[PDB]
Subunit: 940 residues, 2 copies
């Protein structure tokens, strides 16, 4: 059918010319800054040397600079020709043509790329290019030219490619075939006069339901990944330069940036001439900042304060010369989404959101891609969702009509959605031939509006103007309550808990000193008292490791050591330095000060004797048998049984072997008890397994009301040895029947069933959590507190916490070494149903005691008339510039009770203020809605 | 490709002979019993007259008898020929060849059918056949014959039909084509010698992974449907006779019967010779009784007592000569299934269940058709599920390989499942050519076991022996918690509430006198005291209208009048007669007796002033604005707003018009108040709509602690007029956020979300309920009590009760006429969370007061030491034969608390006994499991 005759023939087979200049070429390498090397160039004879040939290398962390001094050949003849220099793209680097140094040019784009030499100025210039190693040898040759001949070659390549994508039943496929025919006729027998003429004839063969197809070129950059931050800091400057050279070459282009800190990275590295580059670039057009967010992160693990700073400290750039923005919120690589996001968005002045994964196309009780998200708070979020092709559809895309068809099926709207650029790497490239892409697509389809029109230059702001018109304001709409569920690729989330232990301890610790440091305002006045400039710098370093890829611990071994480096550590070390600092001139009013933040036995007979409860491990079995309440009457049989099953997948996802029996840790145990006291009781029982390894958990608790508490504390200490690729968990089967699982999400409590959605794919079902998870019919249940482990699962009502994971990924630090784990099991009652939530989250508190000399009185309870047990205040902090402070509260128990808010203060005034710390004229609500975040601001 | 050459040719086109006997033929009709007409035949000249021709008719409820006296033609020649008489099947009737009357023969089979004349006895006999009218004229002609020639014609017809079903890619399709070729060769030119010879040649062309394909011929009969009970009582005797004549013709055949009462219907109508027919039939083989159930019904609407009697009173036949049974439970036409069924099955000694609808094939978190059902009680149920082809796959099936392929995909097992016979009609037919069906399918596939073997004679009992072997005992298995959800065809469930009002009032009323009538045992001894024989006859009539098709009210107009007839009415009338009877010699110990069963204002300012709560309707709007708790703090905005939307579908399913605006009942209302008192407060507000109709609801409640109660009572009285095809509902939006909806199912409380499963198809989502439905985060919520309406819906947390429905089905009584409706709205609190459930269900109680002369003392509280608020005792009754009584309890609140059971009695003993009232040796449990039915028995 002549299918392989037209397609594979001409696609393979003045005009393009290749000249070679061997001399004047220099090479440089550092085996030990662009401004530092410019002074080391002209002076004497340094490591800069003549290359003139291909330079091989070997694996190193070193970077290799390269210098090419080119003299323009002849005068007029080769000037009209297009000047070009081809380079082989290495792992990283930069390219410059500095005098002395004005420019910064793009590198990080794909292995194929073009560098244009200015035809405006006739003379000799210089070139500075470095190549990051990880080895990749560069192929460098000068390439002259024509533009019209190469255009036809590209247009034909995108022609026949579009012929294959078009339906064979349509006449267009037979048309495009005949179009690929006539072109091949004059193209074959090597004729320049025919090629240029045939290009004109092809255009004549080209030009002879309201819908729209658009796209926005973007670069998604991970600040920490298998390449480090310092190296990727050089990678982000390559993303800006590719646009700058594209602007003069092509107009109407659109770029978006998920990092507000990206601006600062460029302003710190290139403060001089590139601060004045951004202003005409951003203000006029062609640039948009999405979300104005300081960090792109997973929202499940951290608190709302992490989401509070990124909005506020990312809005700080708006105070500088900046501020052309968009209403879209972009978290493409983020796994999972919080249920408080619809509430956080509207308050942050951002009305749109984008989600890559976590969706399906079918009747789900859900129509399509485009979606209006209604959280459990009751608020609504209009969000724009890309199809199942994700962001890799338009990434490095020359295929034209290929994914255009697959985009139309999931989406209805009046139009589709395309995201240009790659989100996997040091940063995404932006192709320079996109100008022809938009043009050649306007060659196939006619102009005027009848058939869908092709415009790549439209902005999402105008796109959101279209959705406000076509579709109704709505009452009954696409509706999904809570979060979304698809293949999560949880992976490292529960793996390498040691980086969580450091972070989660640093999380609370940095969240510790915040508010109380504003309570010393009255004591010693200067600015009064608050580490405004001091704590601002603190949040700068912490948010850097909190990114979506970095925080769970999925990365190479090099940057993983930078996670356990002072980056995480010194934060705790500086905060523990400040907490011992501010105390000196403060606590001096305290003789003996207990510092805590709030606002108002037997062996053979196997018993630990007390009133509250009883939990018993059988003899020689090693497994807890009876957990039973006398007053309640609930008896348990199948507790705390540790289970170890291997893992055969990589760091990304988790895939267990087919029907693999999980090895129990039960063995010929021995019995022991740590101490002897009414205050302290710890009974020790040893567990062992094949390839002997010591797995230790501890038992701690306070009796009743001599010790006082309602909850046990069980901490696990395990030093891993030998066998890798294993996944360890501890089971807490409730032996109870409930279709609902109580779990506390970020700023609230979400309601999720015991069984996953019927559309679920992956066998293994695990859920990420903050602190505790419960099962409650409201008259009773079982509550499980935990530390350093964010994961858990619903087994058919068997509570299983994930202690450790060891992926087969190329990381050797995820396998062996000691670990300190902690968790708990708590008895549940209807009266204690609101108590278990209160005794869970903030239990991470660490007791600390210190005393100065005595002059004063140390008892002051300064909080004013609120007293709501159903509400919990997560964050209260100051401002930037005044020093007005903000107060943010959220209701713990919601969905049933309507919390009356009497919260107020004295000696000053108060007004309700959103999460962006921006002034809002409703006033303080006397009653809080269920599952509502209440944030306020305080002024003198 | 010669596809239509072989298939449509020979399929259309001594041997078959047609003779006509005009004389000796008689006809009979009753325009005004088989035993009554036999005495009216030979005597004188009655309405029995000579027919000899085709007799036309007209629509009537009459039945037309027919008599054919046939003399055997010649002697030997036409004796060897197969004697047959063809009849045109009418709506109903019976066929007999009585001397004087021995036989009863089958009729109700399809319009085509065969009646064989005995070749054993040479002589003259008689024929008695009646035809039910609803007119259908009968075509009657005597047909002689051969058996070998007709066999080839059938075998060839099932051959070419199997050729089309077989894949064209396989050689079998090309083979069967060539098989259809050679046969057509000798068949075409009218040769008897060739046909008989070619039949032998075809058999030679026939005969030349472990799996099994089986089936069981069955007849599903609805006792009340578009044809009445008295008429279908004649229809059930036609189902038995078709088997009896089939037994001698073909062996190994299997029949099953979902009705245990079906035996009694035959024993009452034919007590003499047909009581001795069943014993060799059932005992040896070929017959199985499924479930031993008295009735086949919807389990959602009635109580457990209805499910208790059907097992017990259906097990009464086992006491007679009976009792070859099966472990399968069959409810094919039943819409929806209870969650207590896994618990009820194991106790009833029945380990298997069958479900037609309510399933899907995909990964649902569910593998396949075959399923092990785990209820919310924790118990497991192994159930056998037919594919998506339901029971109509093998119904009237000559198509052979057709549905054989579609059966294999949903099911894995080692084998598939097929159900022969039709479940829609007066009763299902069983074809007589099934003998050849099993044989011809053994002609295509070889014998011995390699390929799947075809046996239609295997019993499900042996089938359950295979499932115990191949598959594992299991831990992780197919798992679905609670009920199942697919297209329900709710329909008449909420339509025609008047038949529910009569039944639901009769439900409780018949459930009333049961236990307390055993409490008078000591008073006047004879047998002591209990209506053992009296209340047994009561349950006989009531269960008759409780069937799955009859109870919801989906039926013709004729039997619908039989629903409102004394059948439902006299039950209440006889029970209200007995309650005024037994009182006379009982209550005489009571001077003044209050009889109840248990065991221990303003207008312009628009307010009804009291302490407990406040509910306000705005002026002129007609809609309730603020329902607010002061102590709790929950304020409501959007209550009790009646909504009317039309309906464009039939009685079966419910389909609303595409985006049709539901008309509000708001209008220029006027304000009024019924009475004036602290005891009685009713404020009246009128509603009206287009084509004016008076829609009235009432307001009743008791204040606090002069009136005392925690709950309002709102009863609706509406007389329908004019416009039909409408669906009326009243909305109670909570204005709250909950992912869970609290609802009390039969014997317990099931947990269902606010959103339907993602695999749901139909837009409109409505749920059937018993009494109340709630939404609880356990600290608060909203409780809705209702009467006579079993339906409700979850709108995104808007409570909507269905008042009335008017389908477009051919029933004129579902449209107009008055209706009395009642419901309620209740305030919810954590402490009252167990109270709302207690104040909901049994509120249907009706106050009654009567007094006799005074001698005695009327206060005795006889219950002994239980006192569990979380448990509720639904039923306690006596036995059959002694007169030992049984006690059945079930826990209301479960899934959280483990209820300690101290329940016991005095002066006698007690033992745990299952739902079948059969003696069980665990003893009385001291603690009850969550969601567990506890049934016991009491002996002297």
């Amino acid at each position: 059918x002549x299918x392989x005759x037209x397609x594979x023939x001409x696609x393979x087979x003045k005009r393009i010319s290749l000249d070679h200049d061997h001399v004047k070429v220099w090479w440089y390498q550092v085996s030990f800054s662009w401004k530092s090397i410019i002074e080391r160039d002209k002076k004497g004879e340094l490591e800069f040397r003549e290359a003139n040939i291909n330079q091989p290398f070997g694996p190193s962390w070193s970077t290799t600079w390269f210098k090419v001094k080119i003299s323009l050949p002849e005068d007029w003849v080769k000037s009209n020709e297009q000047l070009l220099f081809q380079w082989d793209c290495s792992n990283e680097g930069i390219v410059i043509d500095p005098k002395t140094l004005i420019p910064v040019t793009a590198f990080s784009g794909g292995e194929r790329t073009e560098y244009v030499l200015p035809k405006t100025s006739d003379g000799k210039h210089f070139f500075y290019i470095e190549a990051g190693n990880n080895d990749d040898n560069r192929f460098f040759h000068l390439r002259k030219a024509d533009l019209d001949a190469r255009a036809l070659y590209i247009d034909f390549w995108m022609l026949g490619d579009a012929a294959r994508e078009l339906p064979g039943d349509s006449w267009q496929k037979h048309q495009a075939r005949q179009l690929g025919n006539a072109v091949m006729n004059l193209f074959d027998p090597n004729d320049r006069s025919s090629v240029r003429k045939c290009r004109e004839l092809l255009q004549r063969e080209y030009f002879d339901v309201l819908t729209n197809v658009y796209g926005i070129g973007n670069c998604h950059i991970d600040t920490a990944w298998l390449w480090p931050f310092a190296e990727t800091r050089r990678k982000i400057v390559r993303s800006w330069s590719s646009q700058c050279t594209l602007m003069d070459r092509f107009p109407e282009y659109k770029f978006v940036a998920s990092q507000a800190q990206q601006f600062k990275w460029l302003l710190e590295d290139h403060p001089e001439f590139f601060n004045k580059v951004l202003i005409p670039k951003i203000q006029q057009s062609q640039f948009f900042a999405v979300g104005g967010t300081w960090v792109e992160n997973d929202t499940n693990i951290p608190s709302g304060e992490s989401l509070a700073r990124q909005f506020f400290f990312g809005q700080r750039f708006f105070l500088k010369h900046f501020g052309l923005k968009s209403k879209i919120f972009w978290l493409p690589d983020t796994f999972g989404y919080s249920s408080q996001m619809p509430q956080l968005c509207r308050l942050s002045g951002i009305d749109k959101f984008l989600t890559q994964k976590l969706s399906w196309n079918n009747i789900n009780s859900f129509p399509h891609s485009t979606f209006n998200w209604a959280g459990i708070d009751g608020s609504q979020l209009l969000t724009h969702m890309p199809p199942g092709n994700t962001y890799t559809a338009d990434s490095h895309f020359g295929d034209v009509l290929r994914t255009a068809k697959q985009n139309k099926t999931p989406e209805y709207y009046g139009s589709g959605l395309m995201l240009y650029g790659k989100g996997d790497g040091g940063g995404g490239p932006t192709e320079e031939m996109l100008q022809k892409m938009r043009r050649i697509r306007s060659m196939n389809n006619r102009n005027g509006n009848v058939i869908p029109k092709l415009q790549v230059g439209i902005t999402v702001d105008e796109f959101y103007d279209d959705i406000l018109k076509r579709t109704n304001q709505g009452h009954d709409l696409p509706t999904w309550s809570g979060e979304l569920y698809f293949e999560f690729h949880r992976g490292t989330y529960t793996s390498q808990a040691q980086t969580k232990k450091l972070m989660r301890l640093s999380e609370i610790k940095l969240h510790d000193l915040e508010w109380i440091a504003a309570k010393t305002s009255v004591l010693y006045p200067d600015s009064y008292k608050y580490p405004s400039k001091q704590i601002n710098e603190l949040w700068e370093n912490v948010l850097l490791c909190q990114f979506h890829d970095v925080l769970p611990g999925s990365c190479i071994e090099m940057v993983y050591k930078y996670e356990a480096v002072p980056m995480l550590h010194n934060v705790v070390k500086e905060c523990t330095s400040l907490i011992d600092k501010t105390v000196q001139f403060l606590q001096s009013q305290s003789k003996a000060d207990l510092v805590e933040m709030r606002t108002l036995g037997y062996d053979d007979y196997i018993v630990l004797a007390n009133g509250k409860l009883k939990v018993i491990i059988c003899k020689k079995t090693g497994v807890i048998t009876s957990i039973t309440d006398e007053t309640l009457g609930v008896e348990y049989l199948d507790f705390v049984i540790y289970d170890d099953k291997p893992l055969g997948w990589q760091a990304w996802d988790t895939e267990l072997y087919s029907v693999n029996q999980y090895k129990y840790v039960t063995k010929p145990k021995k019995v022991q008890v740590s101490c002897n006291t009414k205050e302290k009781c710890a009974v020790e029982v040893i567990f062992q397994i094949s390839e002997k390894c010591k797995i230790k958990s501890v038992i701690s608790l306070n009796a009743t009301a001599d010790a006082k508490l309602s909850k046990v504390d069980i901490s696990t200490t395990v030093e891993n040895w030998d066998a890798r690729n294993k996944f360890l968990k501890v089971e807490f089967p409730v032996n109870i029947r409930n279709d609902f699982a109580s779990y506390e999400t970020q700023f609230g409590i979400t309601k999720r069933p015991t069984h996953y959605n019927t559309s679920w794919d992956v066998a293994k079902f695990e859920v990420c959590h903050h602190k505790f998870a419960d099962y409650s019919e409201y008259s009773k249940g079982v509550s499980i507190l935990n530390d350093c482990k964010y994961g858990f699962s619903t087994h058919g009502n068997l509570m299983r916490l994930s202690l450790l994971r060891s992926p087969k990924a190329p990381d050797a630090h995820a396998d062996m070494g000691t670990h300190e784990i902690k968790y708990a099991i708590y008895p549940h009652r209807g009266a204690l149903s609101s108590d278990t939530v209160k005794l869970a989250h903030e239990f991470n508190y660490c007791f600390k005691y210190k005393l100065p000399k005595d002059i004063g009185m140390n008892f002051d309870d300064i909080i004013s008339i609120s007293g709501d047990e159903n509400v919990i205040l997560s964050n209260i902090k100051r401002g930037e510039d005044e020093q007005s402070i903000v107060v943010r509260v959220y209701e713990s128990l919601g969905g049933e009770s309507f919390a009356s808010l009497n919260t107020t203060l004295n000696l000053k005034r108060i007004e309700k203020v959103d999460n962006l710390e921006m002034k809002v004229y409703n006033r303080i609500p006397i009653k809080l809605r269920p599952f509502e975040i209440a944030s306020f601001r305080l002024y003198f």
